[PDB]
Amino acid sequence: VPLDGGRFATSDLNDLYRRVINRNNRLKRLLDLAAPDIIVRNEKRMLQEAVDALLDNGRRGRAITGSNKRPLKSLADMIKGKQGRFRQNLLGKRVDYSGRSVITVGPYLRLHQCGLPKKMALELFKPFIYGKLELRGLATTIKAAKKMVEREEAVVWDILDEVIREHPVLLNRAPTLHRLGIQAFEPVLIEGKAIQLHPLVCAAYNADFDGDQMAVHVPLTLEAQLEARALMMSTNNILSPANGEPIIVPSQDVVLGLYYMTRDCVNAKGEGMVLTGPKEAERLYRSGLASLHARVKVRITEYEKDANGELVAKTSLKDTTVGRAILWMIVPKGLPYSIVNQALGKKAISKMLNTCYRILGLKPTVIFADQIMYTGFAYAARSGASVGIDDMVIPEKKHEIISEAEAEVAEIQEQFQSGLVTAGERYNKVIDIWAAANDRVSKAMMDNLQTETVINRDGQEEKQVSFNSIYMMADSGARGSAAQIRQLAGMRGLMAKPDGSIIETPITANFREGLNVLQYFISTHGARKGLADTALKTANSGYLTRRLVDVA
Amino acid sequence: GITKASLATESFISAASFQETTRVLTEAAVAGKRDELRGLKENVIVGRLIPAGTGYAYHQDRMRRRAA
Amino acid sequence: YSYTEKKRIRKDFGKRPQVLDVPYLLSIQLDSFQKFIEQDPEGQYGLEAAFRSVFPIQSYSGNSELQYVSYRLGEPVFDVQECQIRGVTYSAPLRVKLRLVIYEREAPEGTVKDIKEQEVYMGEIPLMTDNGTFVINGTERVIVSQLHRSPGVFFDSDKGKTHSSGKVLYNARIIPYRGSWLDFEFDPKDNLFVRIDRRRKLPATIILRALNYTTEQILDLFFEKVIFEIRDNKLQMELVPERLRGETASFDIEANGKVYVEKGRRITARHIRQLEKDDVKLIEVPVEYIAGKVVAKDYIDESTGELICAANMELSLDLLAKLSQSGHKRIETLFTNDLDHGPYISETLRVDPTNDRLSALVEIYRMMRPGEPPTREAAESLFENLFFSEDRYDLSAVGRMKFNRSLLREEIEGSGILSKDDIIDVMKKLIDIRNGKGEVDDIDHLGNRRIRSVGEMAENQFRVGLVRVERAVKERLSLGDLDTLMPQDMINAKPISAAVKEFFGSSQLSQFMDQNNPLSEITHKRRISALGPGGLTRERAGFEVRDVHPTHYGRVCPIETPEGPNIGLINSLSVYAQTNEYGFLETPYRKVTDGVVTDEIHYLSAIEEGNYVIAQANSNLDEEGHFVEDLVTCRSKGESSLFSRDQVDYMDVSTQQVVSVGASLIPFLEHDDANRALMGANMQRQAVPTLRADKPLVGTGMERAVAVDSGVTAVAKRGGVVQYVDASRIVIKVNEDEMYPGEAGIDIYNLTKYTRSNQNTCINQMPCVSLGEPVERGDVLADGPSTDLGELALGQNMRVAFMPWNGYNFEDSILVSERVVQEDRFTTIHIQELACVSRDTKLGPEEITADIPNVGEAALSKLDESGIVYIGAEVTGGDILVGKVTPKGETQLTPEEKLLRAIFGEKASDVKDSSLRVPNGVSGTVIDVQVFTRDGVEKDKRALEIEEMQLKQAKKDLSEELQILEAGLFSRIRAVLVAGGVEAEKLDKLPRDRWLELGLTDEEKQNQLEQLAEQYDELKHEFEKKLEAKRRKITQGDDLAPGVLKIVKVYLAVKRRIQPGDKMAGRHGNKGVISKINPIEDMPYDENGTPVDIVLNPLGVPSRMNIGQILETHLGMAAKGIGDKINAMLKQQQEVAKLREFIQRAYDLGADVRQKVDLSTFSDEEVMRLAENLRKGMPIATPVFDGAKEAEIKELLKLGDLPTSGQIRLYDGRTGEQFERPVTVGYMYMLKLNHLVDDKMHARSTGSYSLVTQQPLGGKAQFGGQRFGEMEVWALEAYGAAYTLQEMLTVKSDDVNGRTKMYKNIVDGNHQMEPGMPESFNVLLKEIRSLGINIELEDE
Ligand SMILES: [Mg+2]
C-alpha cells in the first residue's frame, strides 16, 4: 500500500512469496537446461529453505532477514504469539463507541452513577443523537444532524441529555484483574474532561486519583443495555465473587470520619445529658451545645425481624455518644443499635454493611453504603483531622533503649575480641539484641501514642484512647499500620543487604528525625528490591492468571 | 498442570489460541480434528454468544433444535 | 556577594562547610565529545585513533597503499538554529588528507613511484551544541551514556543451580572490547571445558593443544612433580613437607630417624613441622602407594625404543615393573591431592579425544564451522584469527588493564590480543578459585562496569564505517587502474556517512531530548543506561543487575531510576561523580592524614574505594580538622561500621555526594521514604513551566547550579554594565578590565522568545537585568523556562491545608481554590507545530489555495489570499489553517445522487478539500507560519511576504548589531583619545567616523587607536558579507522530500489553564489529580480570613512515609511568615534601619549554620531591593542530609509570629464554623506535570479501521478505539454478559457488514444487532490455509 509520502509499505509475506517464486522458476529453468545435478540439488535445497522460511521462518536454520537484519514474519508468525491473530485480534480487539479519560472523584455521586464529560458523551453517543435529531424534526437529514452536532447547537445538548438518560456505560480500568474491573454506571453529564468515579467502587477497580485513566464503552443493543443494568451495574456488585465479603466498602476518609464520629472523649462538652433521640443529638451537635464525643444517654428505637418477616420495635435509653446517635439516623431499620455503639473502624463498617446485606438485602444496602459515604466524608471534614510533625511522638526513652543495645553490642564485640564467641554466634547475638531493642522502641512508642490523652473528669485525671491523628488513622484502619508508625516515630530497624542478609547495624532513626546518608543508602537497598519485585511480578501473575483462565 | 491440561483439551481452537499454536495445529491437522465450539474461547474467536450467562439459553435451544 | 545573588539571598540552613564546588553538571557529554572530535597529536582518542586503526590500507599486492595524513572538520553549512528550522542535522564536513602512494614493481626497498596526496570528503560528523545535545533531523537529541560490562577476564560461578547437588561450578570469561568470547568452565565432574562464542563446549585441553603444548608441557604447566628417585630397592621418593598437608597416611614415615606417625593417623601440622625439624628429603615408600599415581612424562625404553608408559597414565605395579627392566633412575609423577591441588587438568586430558595440534585445530574447526570439511590451512587460520589477530580481536586498553589487574600482573599495558600466557593464567586462576585460593568476581561491582559515552560510541561507529570503506578501497587498489586515479575516486563517503547517521539518529541511546524543564534536560544528559547495543535487554535483565550495589555510593544515585520495567537499568549520575580515564566512575573524597581531615580531594574508583576506610560526611569535626569524636562511622569494604579516628583514610566530600541532581532538589529527602523519594525525583522532571516562574520558598541550594549549568539562561560571559536591555536582547558594555585589545567591548545576548520544546512546551527567555545595572561574569542575565532570577523554579508556592475536605481529596485527589485559577498560577503555554504538505500526486499537484469547495466564506475568514491563516489569528478546533485541495477524478455518481444533481444542476467538484485544520478541542493563536517551497515551484504571495519580512529582519538584526558594536568601538576610541593627547571638545567637533584619521603620539596610544580602526573596518566588512550570506540562505530553495512541492508549518500557542484531571505533584512523591476547583468562599480560612489555596489529604502522608512534605509545609509557613513580616514593613514604609535589623535577625537564625549574611555591608538601596525580593516569603535552602532541623523550623516560625506547632485554627468557608482540630497549613511547592487531561481525554463512536483486519485503529492521534483486550473479555464472561461481549467482538470492531447495519439501526432508533463473522476470523482461516492446512467451517 502507498504511504503518505509516496513510499510503499509491504508485508514480509510478499518478500517470502517472491523468493519462493524466484527459486521455483529458476528450478524450472535449470530442469529445462538439463543443468549438472550439483546445481539442481542446490536449487532444490534453496527452494526447500525458501518454502520453509515462508511457512515458518527460523525453525530450520537461521531466520531469513530482509533489508533490516530483522527476521521476516512468516505465515506461522502471523497466527501465533502475543501478537498473532488469536491473541491480538480474535481474543481481544479494539472497539468502537469507546473513550478514555483521567478519572477524578465525585463524592456526591450515587453508587449506580458515574460522571461522564459532555465532550466525551457527545462523541460516544453520536449516532443516537443523530437518530433523535432526525426523529424530533430538528434535522431533515443525517448530514444536517451531523452539522448540528459539529456546531454544538444548544439543542444537541438537550438531545444528548435524553439519549444518555437510562443508558448505562461500562467503565474499565486496566489491568482487568477480575470482573469488577468492568462495571456499568448511569452517566451524569459533567463539564470537565475527567471521568468522575464514585469513591466506593475504587477498591473494586484498584483505582486511585493520582493519574489513573479509565475506558468508557457504550452498550449499543437492548440486550447489552439490560446486561449492563442487570449483571454489571455497580449496585449489583457489592459482594466479592472471590469471597463473599463486601467489595464496595468504605475506606480512607469515610472510615476516618465514621471513626471520629463514633469515638468518645471523657469530659467532652455536653456530657451526661439525656436526649429524646438522634434528632436531638444532631440538633445539639449542630448548634454547638454538645460535642460529637460526649457520652450521653439517648432514647433509641431499634427494629428487629421476628420469626416472620415482620419488623418489631423496641425503645430504650442507650448509653451512647452524641456521634453514635447521629450516625444511627442513617442506619436501616432491621439492624441493632449495637452495630454503631462502638468506635467504627474499617472492619466494623465492613461488617455493618455485610450485616445489612444479609438481613435486609441489596436495596437497603446500597442506600446504606451511599449514606455511610456521605456521612463519613462530612464528618471527616468537620474533624479537621490534619497531620503535623508533633503528631509523630517519639518515645522519650528511645535514646536510652538504643544506648543500652549499644552497650550490649559493645560487650558482645569485646567478647568476640576475647574469643568467647565465634563470628557466627556473635553476629546472631548482635541481630537478636537489635531486634529486641527495636521491639522495645516500638512498644514504648505505641504506648506513648495510643493512650496519651490524659483528661480531667471532674478534676481527677484519667487515661483515654488517644485522639492523635497518626494514631487515629492507624487505629481506624483508614491508612497506616503499626509497622509504619514504627518507621515514623520509632526506629526503622534492621535492613537487609541485596543478598537478603541483615545488616548488623540498624537504622536507629525514624522519618521524623532524619536518616543520615548511610542509613538512607542501606534503606534504598531494599526499597529498590521491593520496587523491582512489583515491576517484575505483574508479568508472572498475568501469566498465571492466563494459564488458569485457559484451563478453566 | 494448568498448561498441559489446557493444551490437552478436546478443542483445537482454544488450545491453539492459548499457546504452542504450531504443535496444536499440527496434531489437529494430521488427526483430522473437529471443533464443536462448546467452550467460551471458541465462541469468542468466532463471534458468537458464549455458552455461559445470557447466551446459555441460546446454546441450549441451538442444541435441542439440532438434536431434534 | 554577586549582583545576581544579593538581589535575593536564599537563607541557608546547612551546617557543614562546602569543601568542593558542585562541578559542571554536563561535563560527561562535553568532555566525551571533545575527546572524539579534537585533534589528538597522539593516536589515543577519537577520530585520529579511528583513522590510524585502519590506515595505511595496503592491497593484496605491493604496488600501492592509501595512507592517512590529517583530518579536519569544516564549518557547518547551517548553524544550530537554522538546522532546527530547516529540519536538518547540525553537522560539520569531515575533510581527510589521504595520500595514495605507489611503489614500483621490483626493488628490495619498494620505493615510491609517486604520491598523489589530496583531501577527500568522508561524511559529515554531527556536532554537539554548547549544552551537550545534538540536532539530528531538526530535533535535539541526547546520546545517553552506557553502563556496560568492562572488557577483561571475569571469574564467576553458579551456586548449586546445576546438577541437583548444590555443587558450585566455576567459570572464567574473557570478554574483549571487540572479538570472540572465551569461556572456561567446570562440569559437575571437575573437568575443565573451553567454549568459544557460547558454542558447544570442548575440553579445555583442546585449546591448550591448539597452542603447541604437548601433554607433557601441559602437565608441567599445571602441576608439580612428585619424584620417585628409586635406588637399587626400597623405593626412595623425594618429598617437601607441605606436600603431605592433610595426607592420608598410606605408610609410616621413617627417615633420618624412625617413625613419626604410624598407620591409621592422618597428618596434621605438628607432623609436618617435626618432619621439617628433621629436615627430611628422601623417604622409603611401599609399592601399593605408587599404584594409582599419574606419571608426568613419556617414558620409553632404550632396548626397543617405543613407548613404555605415556604421560598422564595412572601408574601401577605393572608399569613400574616394566620401567624397572629398563632401569630408569628418576620417575616423575603429578602431585595431586584433594582440596589443595586438583587433578582437573589430567582428568580433562583423559576426556578429550585429541592427541596433537592438528587434531585440536580440527576439533575447534568442527565446533566453529560444522559441516565444513576442515583443511589444515583453514583449521590453522580460524584459530589464529579467533583471538590472536589484531584486526579481529581487541582486548582494549581498558580490557588489557582489567585483564592484567585480575591476574595480579604488574604492568597494565599490553597487546590487544590474547597470548599463550594470558590463556594459561586464566586457566590457572580458575583452577585456583576451584582449589579455594581465590574468590569469584562480583559482576555488578562498579569496578567491573564501565561508562561508554557519546564520544566513544561515535568513534566505534566511525571505525565501523571506516572498515566498510576499507574493504572497498582494498578491492579498488587490486585493480590495474592504478596510475591515473586520485584518492577521492576510491573513497565512498556514503557508507561512512551511513554509519554515523545510523548511530546518531537510530541508536537506542540516541534519545529524543527530554525538554520539559531545565531539570529534565540535565537529567537526560547525566543519564546512564545498561541497555543499548552491547548492553542488556530489559526483558532478560534479572533482579541482581537492577540492585543498588554498595559501589553505587557516590557514583550512581540509588533513588533516581524509573519505576517501570527498566528499573535499575536506567540510572542517574551522582552530583560529584566523574569518569576515569578508563571509563570507571569515581567519586571525590577528602584525605584524612593525621586525624586531620584535609581539604585535599582525591577521586577514588570503586576498586580503590574498597581498600580504604572512608568516614561519612555527617561526621563532626572541629576547627583544626580533627574529628570531635573518636569513634567514627565509616564504610571500609562495602560494609559499614564504627572505627577509631586514627583508622580513617578518607571522608565524604559532601552530604549530597550520594544522590543525583534530581534528588538533590528534594528538601527534607532524609525524612522521605525512598520509594516516594524515587517518585518525587521522577516527577520533578515532568513539571511544565508555568506563565510566571516562582522560586521555591523551601529549596536545597542546588537550584542555581541546575538553572545555570543547563543552557536555558543567558549567563554573562564577561562582566560589565547593562547598556541596553529589552525583552528580546541584552547589550552589555564590558568592563575595561575584561576587554581584549582591538575589540568593541560589547556583549550581545539574543534571547529565545516563545519557541517550542521537544514536548510542545514553551521555551521563552526573559531578562533579569534592568538598564544600567552592573553585571559580573557568570551572572544570570535572562531567565529560561522554569527559572526565577537564575534559580530553578519548577512549580508554584501554594498555601496547602492538610485535612479531608468532603471527599474531594479522597484517594490522592487535590482540591484547588478558584484563586489558583484566577491568578493563572498553573497556566502553561504549549506550542504546537502543524504541517500542511502539498505534494505531486498522479492526478496532478495539490494546491494551497483559499478557494475550497463545500466551505463557506465564514470558514475562509482568517485565510489570506494564499489560503494560509494570518499570524495572530485566534483559531479553534476545525478552523482551516492552510487551505489545500487535492485533484481527484472518476467520482462515479450513484444513480440517486446523479438524479439529485440533474434536478439542481450543481456540478461536482474536480478537487477535494484536503485542508489543514486545527485539531478538535485545541484553541490557540497562530504565532508563526513558515513556508518551505521546492525549487521550480513558484512562491505564492505569502511565501514572498514571509521572505521579504525575513530579509528585512536579517538586514535589521545585522545593522543593529553593527550599530551597537561600532558605538562600542567609538566609545573605546574616544576613551583612548582623551587618555593621551586629549581632544575632549575637539572630538565632538570632528565628524564621527574620521576620528580614525587622527594620528596620535604613540607611546602605546596610536597602536591601540589603529588596531581599533582595523577592528572597525573588519566589523563593517564582516557585517557586509554576513548580510549576503543571510540573503542567499533566505532566498534559496528548500531541499524537501521527493514529491513534496511545499510545506506550510503553522505554530499555535495554546494557554492551558488548570482544570479537574490535571496531575499535580510535590517534590516528595505526593502526586495527585485535581478533583474540584472550589470557589474562594468555600475554601477553609484562618482567623484573618485568608483562604487556603490547596487542600491535601492527610491520609496520604503516614502510609506513604514521605514526612518531608510535612516539614516542607512547616518550613514553608515559616519562610512565608518572614515575607509577610517584611511585606508589612514595606507597606508601613518603615525605616531601612528596621528592615535591616529584622532581615539580619532572619538571616542569623539557625544552629551553627555555615552561611553568614552581613547586611551592614549592604547599602540602603541594596537592602531595600533585597527586602522587596523577600516580601513574598524568604527563600530557604535545606541541603539534603544537611538540612534544617525541626527546632530551627520552630525557631523561624517563632520569629514570624506563627504557632511553632505548624497548625492553625481553620474555619469552614461554607458554614463559618471551626474545624474541630488544628490543621497543618503551610506552603508547599506544587508542580504541574505534563499529564494534562486535555491530552488524555479521547472518545470515538466510529472512525477509520485497519487494512488487514478491519478493527479500529490504535491511538487518539489516529482517532482510534480502546483495546478491549483478553482480560476484559474474561471480565464479561465472568458476568453473564454474552450480548455485550458479542457486540464488542462482532459489531463494534470487526464485523464489517454488521457494523454499518448497527449504525443505521442506531440512527433509526432500533437498538438491535445482526452480528456476522469477525473479519479477523476470515483472515485467520485464510492464513491457516496458506499453510498446507485445510481448515473449514462445517456448515451443517
Ligand atoms: Mg495511580
Numbering used by the authors:
A (entry chain D): 253 to 804
B (entry chain D): 1308 to 1375
C (entry chain C): 3 to 1342
Manuscript excerpt for this entry:
Bacterial RNA polymerase (RNAP) holoenzyme initiates transcription by recognizing the conserved –35 and –10 promoter elements that are optimally separated by a 17-bp spacer. The MerR family of transcriptional regulators activate suboptimal 19–20 bp spacer promoters in response to myriad cellular signals, ranging from heavy metals to drug-like compounds. Here we report one crystal structure of a multidrug-sensing MerR family regulator EcmrR and nine cryo-electron microscopy structures that capture the EcmrR-dependent transcription process from promoter opening to initial transcription to RNA elongation. These structures reveal that EcmrR is a dual ligand-binding factor that reshapes the suboptimal 19-bp spacer DNA to enable optimal promoter recognition, sustains promoter remodeling to stabilize initial transcribing complexes, and finally dissociates from the promoter to reverse DNA remodeling and facilitate the transition to elongation.
To understand how EcmrR facilitates promoter recognition by RNAP and subsequent formation of RPo, we assembled an RNAP-EcmrR complex on a heteroduplex DNA scaffold containing a 19-bp spacer between the –35 and –10 elements in the presence of tetraphenylantimonium (TPSb+), a TPP+ analog that was shown to up-regulate BmrR-mediated transcription. The resulting 2.5 Å cryo-EM structure of EcmrR-RPo contains a 13-nt transcription bubble with template strand (T-strand) DNA positioned at the polymerase catalytic center for RNA synthesis. An EcmrR dimer binds to promoter DNA between the –35 and –10 elements and introduces a 58° kink in the DNA backbone, facilitated by A:T base unpairing at the center of the pseudo-palindromic sequence recognized by the EcmrR dimer. In addition, EcmrR under-twists the 19-bp spacer DNA by 82° relative to an ideal B-form 19-bp DNA and realigns the –35 and –10 elements for recognition by σ4 and σ2 domains, respectively. Although EcmrR and σ70 bind to opposite faces of the promoter, they engage in a direct interaction in the EcmrR-RPo complex. The EcmrR NTD and R157–D160 short helix of σ70 NCR are in close proximity, as evidenced by their connected cryo-EM density, bury 228 Å2 of their surface area and make several favorable interactions through their surface residues. Intriguingly, we observed strong extra density in another hydrophobic pocket (hereinafter designated site II) in the cryo-EM maps of EcmrR-RPo and EcmrR-RPitc-4nt. The density likely corresponds to the tetracyclic sterol head of CHAPSO, which is routinely used in cryo-EM sample preparation of bacterial RNAP complexes to alleviate preferred orientation problems.
